[PDB]
Design a protein around this ligand. Sequence first.
Ligand code: CLA
Ligand code: CLA
Ligand code: CLA
Ligand code: CLA
Ligand code: CLA
Ligand code: CLA
Ligand SMILES: CC1=CCCC(C)(C)[C@H]1/C=C/C(C)=C/C=C/C(C)=C/C=C/C=C(C)/C=C/C=C(C)/C=C/C1=C(C)CCCC1(C)C
Ligand SMILES: CC1=CCCC(C)(C)[C@H]1/C=C/C(C)=C/C=C/C(C)=C/C=C/C=C(C)/C=C/C=C(C)/C=C/C1=C(C)CCCC1(C)C
Lengths: 80, 30, 160, 42, 33, 92, 137, 731, 61
Amino acid sequence: SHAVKVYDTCIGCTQCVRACPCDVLEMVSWDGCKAGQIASAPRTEDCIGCKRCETACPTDFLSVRVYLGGETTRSMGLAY
Amino acid sequence: MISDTQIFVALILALVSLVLAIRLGTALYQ
Amino acid sequence: VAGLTPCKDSKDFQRRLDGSVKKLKTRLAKYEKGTPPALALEKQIERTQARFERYGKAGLLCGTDGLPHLITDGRWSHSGEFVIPGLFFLYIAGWIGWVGRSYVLFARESDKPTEKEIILDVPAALSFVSTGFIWPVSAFKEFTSGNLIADESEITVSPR
Amino acid sequence: MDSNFLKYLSTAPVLLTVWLSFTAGLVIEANRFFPDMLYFPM
Amino acid sequence: MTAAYLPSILVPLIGLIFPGFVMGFAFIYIEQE
Amino acid sequence: AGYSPVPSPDNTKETYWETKAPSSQVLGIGKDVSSGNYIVASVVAAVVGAACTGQCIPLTVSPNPVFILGSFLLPYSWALHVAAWIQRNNGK
Amino acid sequence: TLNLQIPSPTFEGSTGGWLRAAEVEEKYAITWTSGKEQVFEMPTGGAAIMRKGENLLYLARKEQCLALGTQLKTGFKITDYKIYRIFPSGEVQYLHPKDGVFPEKVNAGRIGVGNVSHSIGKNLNPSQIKFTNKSFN
Amino acid sequence: TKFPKFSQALAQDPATRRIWYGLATAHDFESHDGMTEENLYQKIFASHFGHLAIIFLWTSGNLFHVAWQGNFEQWVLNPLKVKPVAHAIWDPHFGQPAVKAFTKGGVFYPVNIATSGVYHWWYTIGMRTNNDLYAGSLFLLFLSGVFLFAGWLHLQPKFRPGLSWFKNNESRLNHHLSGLFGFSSLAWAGHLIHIAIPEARGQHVGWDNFTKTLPHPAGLTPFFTGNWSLYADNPDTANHIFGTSEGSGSAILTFLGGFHPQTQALWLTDIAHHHLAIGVVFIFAGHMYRTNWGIGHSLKEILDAHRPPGGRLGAGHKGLFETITNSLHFQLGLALASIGVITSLVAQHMYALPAYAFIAKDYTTQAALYTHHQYIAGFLMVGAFAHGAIFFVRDYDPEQNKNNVLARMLEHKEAIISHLSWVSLFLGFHTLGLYIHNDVVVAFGTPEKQILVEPVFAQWIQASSGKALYGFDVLLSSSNSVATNASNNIWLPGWLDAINSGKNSLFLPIGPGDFLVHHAIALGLHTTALILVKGALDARGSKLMPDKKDFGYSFPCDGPGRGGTCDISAWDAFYLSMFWMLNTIGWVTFYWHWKHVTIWQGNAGQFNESSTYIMGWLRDYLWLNSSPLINGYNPFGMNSLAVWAWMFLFGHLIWATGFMFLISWRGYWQELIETLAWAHERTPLANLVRWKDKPVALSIVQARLVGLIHFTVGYVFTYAAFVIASTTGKF
Amino acid sequence: VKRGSQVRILRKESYWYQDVGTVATIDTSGIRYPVVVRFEKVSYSGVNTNNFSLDEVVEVV
Ligand code: CLA
Ligand code: CLA
Ligand code: CLA
Ligand code: CLA
Ligand code: CLA
Ligand code: CLA
Ligand SMILES: CC1=CCCC(C)(C)[C@H]1/C=C/C(C)=C/C=C/C(C)=C/C=C/C=C(C)/C=C/C=C(C)/C=C/C1=C(C)CCCC1(C)C
Ligand SMILES: CC1=CCCC(C)(C)[C@H]1/C=C/C(C)=C/C=C/C(C)=C/C=C/C=C(C)/C=C/C=C(C)/C=C/C1=C(C)CCCC1(C)C
């Protein structure tokens, strides 16, 4: 599957979580940002690689990165 | 001018080279 | 003379002139005298003859094909072929670039630089256009005063 | 003249069109009165 | 049996049999668990 | 970082230098030669090479082997004079 | 848990529905309660009528299920949509509102997965992680 | 699945992407699962052995087919009149008209006429009978077998080399310079003296004769006495009929210079002397680096020591030793660039200075060889830059290359790229502008208004080499110059005879058309270099994707996030540079072919006059010379050029097909294939059959590659057909 | 660096590397990247603001 990673530049805006067509990103608690929340990628096996999370990211270069890796049915979005 | 015996010797050498090529292909595939 | 012959005394050049004039005269033979077509073709013939005569007297060199060739090596006998025209270009181009850069800085120090760049302040633009006539000394003055070249630590660059 | 109309004339495409038409006219008239100049006369 | 028969004996082989067998074996190999 | 160590020849030293001149290990077998020796060698090599080159400039169908050999001293003199500098600025 | 007896939104049928891969590998389901009988757009194509009460729908992709859920949440004001994944064994799983609350808002209990303790500029180089098991993080 | 045994990520793919990517990544060993450095190097070693075996088998097949189905024995008699046949044709699709049309070469069965020049090459070497070619083919088969066995053996546990051996630079350099290059050229000189020259003089020398036949009447006494000049006395007369003893001499080593009159090629004695000299030079060069003894250098020491004290290069060449030795991609790029330059040189020099007898009069052969080697050169240069980029992505270690030349290149990459872009725009703007100016004036009927610049610089170089056509009187055109007086009695007579005769391609006369096309070539080289250099330098990162090295070399994109990131990879830079490289080589070969065609028909004025505007190229080169090719077959019959006409249209077809993949992108096809899969699954009597790999559309990078391959095949085949058919139909 | 001060960016991955921005606020709570810098030049993503650490910004003269 694709490898989705989050970095400390995260500000907890949550737009990455709201932009994901699947449910791959969720907000968890953190102390490194004013919002007190950081993005996490627990369901990375459902990622398709659209990079909508990357698009909906306001930090200078992204706090969330999608590295496209091995392809599966779910990653390829094959309904057949 | 090139005789059938000459062509057959060439074919035998080609077959030997094919056997060696198969051996090398196996060894590389490993 | 360099590797070719002067165009003023080239049979190929004379033949090309004769061919052009003969084509024009053949076109003219089918038009009544004094009609606009006849006058236009006669003027074309005159222009062709004047062009060939001027090229011959200019000192241009012509090859076996009968067409003028340019010696763009630096020879002063052929400066008018590339160097002096090139100097005129460089003058005009530096004028344009200098005034454009000046206007860019002027708009940079404005309330809305983008607005100044899409909707121009033509009084200031014409001011800079006028300034552009001594761009060589002005550009060198900028360079020596250090207002032209930016420091390596003040220009954004991608990571290695 | 209306200042808004003057700003509209100052807009980039209008100025580019006018300036390049002026330049084309300059070159065309130069070639009309001094044609076939393949060289700087020296 | 002269060498002049070798083209007619071989070209059909090299052009239809060798490709067919290679394609079949490669298919079996690529689609195999 | 997992690359295998790069093998180098025996007695391979560190020749990197940011000083005014290299360390004189750059000159190898001639590291102990004197700067005056290098100067005299360079001058003699230049003269002999120039002479032997002039003796062969209009090359004939049968050039002299000794002149051919000595003509190679003109390129040699360059290295020698460079070495002279190096050895003068390394203390010798 | 999922109740397989919930009625469906009286769809008229389409060629965009699930296929043999749904019966062989995975088939997703979405259940939601509606206050009235509205008309919504199927993620596969066409219009359907949702019922007053509980509606169960079957799709082939989690993305289709979540697109339908987003349509319900935004177009309508239905936010009680639950998503499940069903295998041929019949092992229904629960996926979308995993922790009963949508991921867009933090909730106590979640553990960060895939978080890195530096910026992207601090990643190692492939030369540094070559012929080694190190990770570029 | 276990198809891509080297990648579980592909083996577990449920689609056809697994098969495609297993095909396309089979030879990227570094990326394979569990690949160690030792295994990598040993596999590369064995693969090199196999590649050498393949080359030997290919040359053996050429020799065997020319010996069996060829007309070599009746070609060596009248080489200027007989067409050399490559191999027989056996196609069960041919009609009787096709068989009759292809029955040529003096044989009685359909044949292909060779355009490779192997006939001339072998004749010059000394091959005269078909038995010689057959023996050569046998030996090359034996050598292929030997190298295959070597490759298999060096994969065995007790014979697998170690990395301390693979990274031993000094010994490999010494052996390659001394034996592979030096002693190999010395052996070629020995061959040319013992076989080629006696064979060219009508004396058969072979294994049954060479141990009793003296290459020179004096034997080796002149060599072992120091009287080496005795080996240059009595060269071949100007009336020597190649292959016969009439007019022959006894010299074995000379420096006559120029070309043999009858054969119109370089003297074989000159070639032998050349090879002997470079052999001894290479043998000397191969004793430079240190090995198991104390003498020699160490490349690490030299590299570290070479740092200018001014500091304008920083740390100089410190760390480059380790970088190059540990990066196979750096070595691959260096080798590819050097081989590309050398093959361009091979093309440029082999048409100006033919070395094989009567090759110059085989017009189609010469054009085919030049085009072949120029295209190979461009491919190799593109590969060199691609592997430089791959090195930057994968093998570059900044800490190791702390402030050396490489790090400085990366530091001012912006300046480099911007200046390269400026020079490209400069060249393009002004070259295209001059071409359009000429087009418009000629169209309006005023060709005298064209801007025609005499290439006085190139003409000056020609005059310096000794061309008296242009009046410059510089170095060798001047009879009182020191340059002339120095070589007047060694090679200058013959060299001047060659240069100042219009019978050859040596320093062809040039004009404003040559000037303009040369600046077009400069534009092409600079723009291809721009694309490749930008790709290599931005491979590690850019302002858009400052972490590209994490994603690698050939990822598809980074999404539509920051305004769009299509083609943001160094692989994509390569993909575009391949269009530009195909454009530049097309220009080069167009120029070469048109100039030489006009010279061959004797109407060089046509080129001199029409090369100055693009309509001239479109009309007097393409349109004019495509007639015989497109008439290869027609409603009224067919001839042997029908195959080339068919391949012409084939190239057009595949080119336009590549346009499909290059313009149409994935999403459309993925949504179409979805409907196709639905249809197959719901069609009765066909749903009984089911795919084992889910049918998916091609990936983004895969589609780019496939379109590029189709485009390149169309390019190459179309121009091959055009060049060969037009040359063969005009002469 | 204080509020309303010109600071040059020193983060290499930043669109504004070696560029000047204005500090809008500095959070003393103890977060990883306290300072907030506003720029006139918009980035590729369209954002003209970012959060930086105190070691990635240098005050200009
Ligand atoms: C390079 C190899 C090759 C060879 C040797 C042949 C040979 C043949 N082709 Mg051609 N063909 C080829 C490539 C080749 N083709 C390709 C690449 C294409 C695709 C464009 C075609 C497309 C093509 C067409 C469209 C036609 C031919 C036909 C023919 C036949 C010649 C005309 C004739 O009168 O025969 C015909 C007379 C006969 C008596 C035919 C007997 C053939 C026997 C039965 C062959 C044995 C098959 C073998 C058992 C299969 C083993 C399968 C295994 C590998 C898995 C002949 C059998 C013509 C034909 O009639 O084909 C049947 C024909 O119409 N070919
Ligand atoms: C001897 C020199 C040499 C060597 C040793 C290598 C080695 C390598 N190259 Mg390659 N490369 C070379 C020359 C070389 N290259 C040249 C000259 C170029 C410029 C064209 C390139 C451009 C290049 C790129 C851009 C890339 C590589 C890559 C690689 C690596 C993976 C190879 C791979 O994927 O195989 C591929 C396997 C194949 C079977 C190739 C299929 C396609 C070929 C071209 C066939 C198409 C022609 C068609 C079949 C003909 C039809 C005929 C018609 C009549 C119908 C490998 C280390 C890749 C890599 O790993 O990079 C990190 C990579 O991305 N190379
Ligand atoms: C009627 C003939 C003609 C025409 C239509 C053009 C048209 C053009 N020229 Mg010009 N050019 C001509 C004759 C002509 N040239 C001649 C005879 C010469 C020889 C002297 C040149 C030398 C020349 C150069 C050296 C350059 C051009 C460039 C250009 C293009 C952009 C110019 C520009 O943006 O100016 C607007 C001005 C600016 C944007 C300011 C910056 C650029 C100018 C040219 C700087 C001038 C001063 C500077 C100190 C010169 C240093 C030159 C040195 C590095 C060699 C444009 C297509 C430029 C180009 O192709 O760039 C890719 C370019 O750099 N031309
Ligand atoms: C690589 C060189 C080469 C090439 C390109 C060809 C090409 C050809 N040969 Mg072959 N041939 C070769 C070497 C080669 N030959 C050698 C060395 C011999 C002597 C043993 C022969 C003996 C031979 C005969 C007797 C005949 C042909 C024929 C033919 C034609 C049809 C193919 C065929 O029947 O092959 C059959 C080939 C064999 C049975 C044995 C040789 C096989 C070679 C050694 C394979 C080499 C593979 C290569 C190194 C690597 C492949 C790369 C991979 C990516 C595919 C065709 C023009 C036939 C024809 O119709 O000619 C007009 C024919 O009658 N060849
Ligand atoms: C004298 C000893 C010797 C010799 C003869 C060779 C020979 C070879 N080694 Mg080397 N090698 C040596 C010592 C030697 N090695 C030592 C001591 C080591 C360990 C330190 C190695 C380690 C080593 C490795 C690790 C590898 C090699 C490889 C090779 C092969 C290189 C490819 C090739 O054939 O290029 C042929 C090149 C030439 C014939 C000359 C250069 C070509 C230029 C362009 C000149 C062109 C000439 C002429 C104009 C062409 C026209 C001809 C005709 C068509 C008209 C080659 C067979 C590679 C290989 O393929 O292994 C199987 C390889 O991977 N060697
Ligand atoms: C004929 C087709 C064509 C043309 C004209 C160009 C032009 C260019 N390419 Mg190339 N390119 C092409 C095909 C072409 N490309 C193809 C098929 C590909 C493969 C995808 C590429 C891929 C490619 C890459 C990857 C790169 C280039 C680059 C360049 C530049 C090279 C320098 C140059 O020549 O500047 C001179 C400029 C020109 C020749 C174009 C000027 C056109 C006219 C004459 C100008 C006047 C306009 C006129 C006033 C408009 C009036 C109309 C209006 C009223 C509507 C230039 C912009 C490089 C670049 O950008 O370098 C800076 C670069 O990186 N190209
Ligand atoms: C002729 C004769 C005389 C009397 C007795 C006899 C019965 C023998 C009778 C019959 C002989 C016969 C039928 C001979 C047959 C000849 C044949 C099959 C010849 C074919 C030869 C093929 C050859 C080389 C192929 C070489 C291929 C190579 C390197 C491929 C390279 C490789 C590739 C492509 C992938 C990786 C592995 C490797 C090996 C590096
Ligand atoms: C000797 C002689 C005879 C006649 C008179 C004349 C004046 C000509 C005189 C002098 C001739 C001279 C000096 C000729 C000069 C030729 C030269 C310098 C040719 C060089 C061409 C260079 C080329 C391709 C370079 C290609 C570079 C490439 C791929 C680089 C790729 C790389 C990249 C992109 C990243 C790092 C790794 C790597 C592999 C280095």
